[PDB]
Amino acid sequence: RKLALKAIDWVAFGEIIPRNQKAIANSLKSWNETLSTRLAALPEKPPAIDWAYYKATVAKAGLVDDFEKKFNALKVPVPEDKYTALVDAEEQEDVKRCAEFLS
Amino acid sequence: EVSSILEERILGADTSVDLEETGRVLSIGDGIARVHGLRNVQAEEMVEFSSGLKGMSLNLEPDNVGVVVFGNDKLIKEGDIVKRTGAIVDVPVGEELLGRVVDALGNAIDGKGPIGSKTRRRVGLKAPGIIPRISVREPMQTGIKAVDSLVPIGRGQRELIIGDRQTGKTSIAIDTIINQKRFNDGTDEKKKLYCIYVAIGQKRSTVAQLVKRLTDADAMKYTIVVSATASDAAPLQYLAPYSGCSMGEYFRDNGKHALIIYDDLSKQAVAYRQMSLLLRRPPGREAYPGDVFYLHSRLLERAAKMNDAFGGGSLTALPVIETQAGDVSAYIPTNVISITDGQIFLETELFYKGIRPAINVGLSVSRVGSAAQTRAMKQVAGTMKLELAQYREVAAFAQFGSDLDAATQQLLSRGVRLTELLKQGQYAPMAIEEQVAVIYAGVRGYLDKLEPSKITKFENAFLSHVISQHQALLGKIRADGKISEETDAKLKEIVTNFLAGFE
Amino acid sequence: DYHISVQNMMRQKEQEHMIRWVEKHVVQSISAQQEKETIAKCIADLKLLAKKAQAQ
Amino acid sequence: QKLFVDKIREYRTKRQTSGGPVDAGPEYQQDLDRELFKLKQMYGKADMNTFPNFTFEDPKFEAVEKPQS
Amino acid sequence: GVRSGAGAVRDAGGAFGKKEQADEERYFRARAREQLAALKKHHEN
Ligand SMILES: Nc1ncnc2c1ncn2[C@@H]1O[C@H](COP(=O)(O)OP(=O)(O)OP(=O)(O)O)[C@@H](O)[C@H]1O
Numbered sequence: 115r116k117l118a119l120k121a122i123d124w125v126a127f128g129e130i131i132p133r134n135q136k137a138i139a140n141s142l143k144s145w146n147e148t149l150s151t152r153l154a155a156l157p158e159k160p161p162a163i164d165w166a167y168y169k170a171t172v173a174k175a176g177l178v179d180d181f182e183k184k185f186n187a188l189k190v191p192v193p194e195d196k197y198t199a200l201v202d203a204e205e206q207e208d209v210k211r212c213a214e215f216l217s
Numbered sequence: 218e219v220s221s222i223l224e225e226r227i228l229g230a231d232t233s234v235d236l237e238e239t240g241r242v243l244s245i246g247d248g249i250a251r252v253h254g255l256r257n258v259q260a261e262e263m264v265e266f267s268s269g270l271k272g273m274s275l276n277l278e279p280d281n282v283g284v285v286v287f288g289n290d291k292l293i294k295e296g297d298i299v300k301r302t303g304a305i306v307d308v309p310v311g312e313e314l315l316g317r318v319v320d321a322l323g324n325a326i327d328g329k330g331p332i333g334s335k336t337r338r339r340v341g342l343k344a345p346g347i348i349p350r351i352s353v354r355e356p357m358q359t360g361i362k363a364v365d366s367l368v369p370i371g372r373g374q375r376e377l378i379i380g381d382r383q384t385g386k387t388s389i390a391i392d393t394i395i396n397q398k399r400f401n402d403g404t405d406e407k408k409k410l411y412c413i414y415v416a417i418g419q420k421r422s423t424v425a426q427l428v429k430r431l432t433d434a435d436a437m438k439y440t441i442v443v444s445a446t447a448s449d450a451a452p453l454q455y456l457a458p459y460s461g462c463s464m465g466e467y468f469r470d471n472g473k474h475a476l477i478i479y480d481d482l483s484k485q486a487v488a489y490r491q492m493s494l495l496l497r498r499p500p501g502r503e504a505y506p507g508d509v510f511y512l513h514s515r516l517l518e519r520a521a522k523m524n525d526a527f528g529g530g531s532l533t534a535l536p537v538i539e540t541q542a543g544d545v546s547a548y549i550p551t552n553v554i555s556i557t558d559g560q561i562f563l564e565t566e567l568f569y570k571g572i573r574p575a576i577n578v579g580l581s582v583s584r585v586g587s588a589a590q591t592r593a594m595k596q597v598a599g600t601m602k603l604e605l606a607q608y609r610e611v612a613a614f615a616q617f618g619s620d621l622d623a624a625t626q627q628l629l630s631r632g633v634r635l636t637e638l639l640k641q642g643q644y645a646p647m648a649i650e651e652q653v654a655v656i657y658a659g660v661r662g663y664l665d666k667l668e669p670s671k672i673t674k675f676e677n678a679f680l681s682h683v684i685s686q687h688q689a690l691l692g693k694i695r696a697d698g699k700i701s702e703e704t705d706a707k708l709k710e711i712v713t714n715f716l717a718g719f720e
Numbered sequence: 721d722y723h724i725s726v727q728n729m730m731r732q733k734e735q736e737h738m739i740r741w742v743e744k745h746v747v748q749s750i751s752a753q754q755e756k757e758t759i760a761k762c763i764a765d766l767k768l769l770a771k772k773a774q775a776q
Numbered sequence: 777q778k779l780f781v782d783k784i785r786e787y788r789t790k791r792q793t794s795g796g797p798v799d800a801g802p803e804y805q806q807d808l809d810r811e812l813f814k815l816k817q818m819y820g821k822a823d824m825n826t827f828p829n830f831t832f833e834d835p836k837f838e839a840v841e842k843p844q845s
Numbered sequence: 846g847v848r849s850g851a852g853a854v855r856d857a858g859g860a861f862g863k864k865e866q867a868d869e870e871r872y873f874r875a876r877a878r879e880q881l882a883a884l885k886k887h888h889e890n
């Protein structure tokens with residue numbers, strides 16, 4: 115799970131000055147800080163499972179081997195990012211408006 | 218399997234018999250047994266009774282040998298046979314004790330199996346002399362801003378944690394133990410510190426709570442908890458500091474660095490007083506025997522910083538003294554204050570004044586001084602210490618500070634902000650770079666405009682920001698160990714930006 | 721780890737029960753064993769002779 | 777060693793017990809049940825033969841109206 | 846070294862402690878009277 119590249123939250127982050135949206139920008143900065151803390155909290159992937167040592171330490175028959183088989187067959191999905199694409203499109207429209215204003 | 222392994226154990230055990238030296242119990246009472254016979258017994262030698270209880274032959278009187286009992290005295294009857302082990306009391310030692318809770322004799326009480334100790338070390342070995350030691354230079358980061366800033370502790374220094382009850386001494390020791398996690402699990406060998414917590418005269422529930430706290434913080438894997446609870450006999454409480462000191466001496470001799478925390482040495486002194494009085498040894502001030510300064514002196518002197526010729530190891534001692542009504546002129550507090558290098562003083566008034574930890578920087582001293590600090594921490598701490606001394610000089614006028622001189626009001630504001638910086642939560646040790654960054658942001662006058670009540674929120678937010686976005690600067694400070702001019706400018710820019718954006 | 725801990729606890733309980741039965745049975749059995757008591761009167765006399773030879 | 781050999785014989789007889797950890801102990805079942813209940817309570821609810829499967833969702837920051845040049 | 850602490854004047858229970866207690870009580874009796882008058886005037890509304 116490689117981290118997505120992002121630009122530094124420079125003074126341009128505070129240069130937005132949205133109408134009644136400075137609190138929104140501060141909340142976004144807090145979200146970024148919390149995301150950085152969460153990323154630093156744990157590694158990219160969870161630790162591996164010592165299936166051999168588990169089976170050696172598992173006296174139960176069937177309830178352990180089938181559990182390991184299910185864990186190997188277990189495949190947790192990943193979330194979607196449709197909102198990311200929508201926000202990117204909105205930012206593109208805002209950039210087009212900014213370009214027209216700049217012209 | 219269980220029956221098979223049990224039979225394997227019993228066949229492995231060999232029931233050998235041999236000659237011994239034995240004596241009869243003339244009189245047993247209050248944990249003191251007067252033994253007839255036993256001519257060839259050394260002083261302070263372990264002897265075992267018929268019932269299985271062990272003992273220590275202290276008084277070698279002509280007619281009888283007075284032995285203290287390592288247990289309840291109901292199991293010793295008049296006429297019982299006291300065998301001679303033939304060796305001075307010694308405790309198991311080594312890396313195998315890490316992660317284990319053991320009694321005063323090293324026996325495991327955590328129910329995690331026998332200790333795989335390969336070496337056996339005595340408890341009354343002499344401390345290293347003048348020549349083997351070296352001056353303390355390496356810091357011993359406790360994780361508390363107040364300690365690492367104003368009362369620094371080096372590796373090989375006896376620093377006292379003195380104060381009344383319910384003031385935070387045990388919390389200071391436990392967060393010092395927790396803080397060493399960042400060094401132990403790392404890679405730098407010369408920074409790892411193995412903690413040894415000795416509990417004296419404390420209920421087993423408290424020790425269990427402490428062990429759970431350490432286990433939740435993943436700090437037990439490098440910590441030894443020697444437990445001599447209040448239920449245990451007085452000799453066990455007397456021996457526990459020496460057992461922990463030997464367990465730390467093992468690390469000290471092998472080039473490793475050990476931290477030993479004698480919790481409630483006053484209770485050990487009480488136990489030794491009980492033993493001495495029951496042995497009819499002549500009493501002294503507060504009924505303590507004459508050799509009570511000797512008891513703590515020959516124990517704390519074993520904390521030392523060996524030179525490179527002897528391995529380069531260390532043993533840092535953190536005795537805990539429970540004063541009564543802040544009376545440091547009492548017998549044991551005076552003894553321990555004289556023996557140790559400095560003390561960390563805690564006050565109930567400061568504890569309930571919002572200054573938690575309750576470290577009284579006016580009374581807390583460190584004779585090793587700034588020599589036990591990193592260059593950056595020393596640089597910020599000199600200024601912070603001078604400014605806090607200036608504030609404490611003018612702290613009397615804070616009640617009527619509105620109608621005062623501009624300089625006095627400036628000093629009051631700076632001191633209030635520094636004091637708010639010194640506050641820290643429990644079980645939350647801070648890295649040295651984080652502490653130096655916070656102290657830099659404070660002493661350089663980046664908080665004077667800020668509201669005094671908002672310092673804590675600002676401190677937490679600034680710590681989160683610097684850890685998240687500016688990790689490179691913190692890493693450079695940690696590796697270099699000093700706040701260089703380029704790092705000074707970078708810190709100035711960062712603190713200015715965060716202060717501007719704080720509102 | 722749930723199963724591992726349950727199995728370990730069961731193993732410990734079985735061990736303590738077995739040792740309890742053993743320690744409560746051996747003493748009474750050997751107290752009732754005179755034919756083993758008479759030879760236990762001489763398990764150590766040869767051992768005593770060997771020990772004294774070691775001393776001398 | 778003859779006493780030790782008798783001890784070994786007793787250990788072997790306990791080993792060969794068809795009932796195993798019975799020992800003619802009326803309270804053995806009650807003690808084992810109490811220990812099992814305590815262990816289950818300490819570890820909480822769990823299944824002897826099951827696998828952990830779950831899913832979750834995270835909603836991002838909602839859009840906030842803000843007009844500007 | 847012998848030192849002191851906060852709020853040690855009333856702990857001694859001397860002339861100054863009784864003086865401070867009496868002064869506080871006399872001041873806050875007047876303050877309670879004023880607050881009671883204001884509360885009664887408000888409750889009349
Ligand atoms: N920095 C701190 N901030 C807030 N609370 C703290 C802090 N340090 C300690 N405490 C609290 O103060 C109380 C006393 O702490 P602690 O047990 O360490 O004190 P002590 O004087 O060593 O204790 P005792 O004399 O009973 O052995 C506890 O409730 C603890 O949680």
Ligand SMILES: [Mg+2]
Nearest residue numbers: 383386387388
């Ligand atoms: Mg305490």
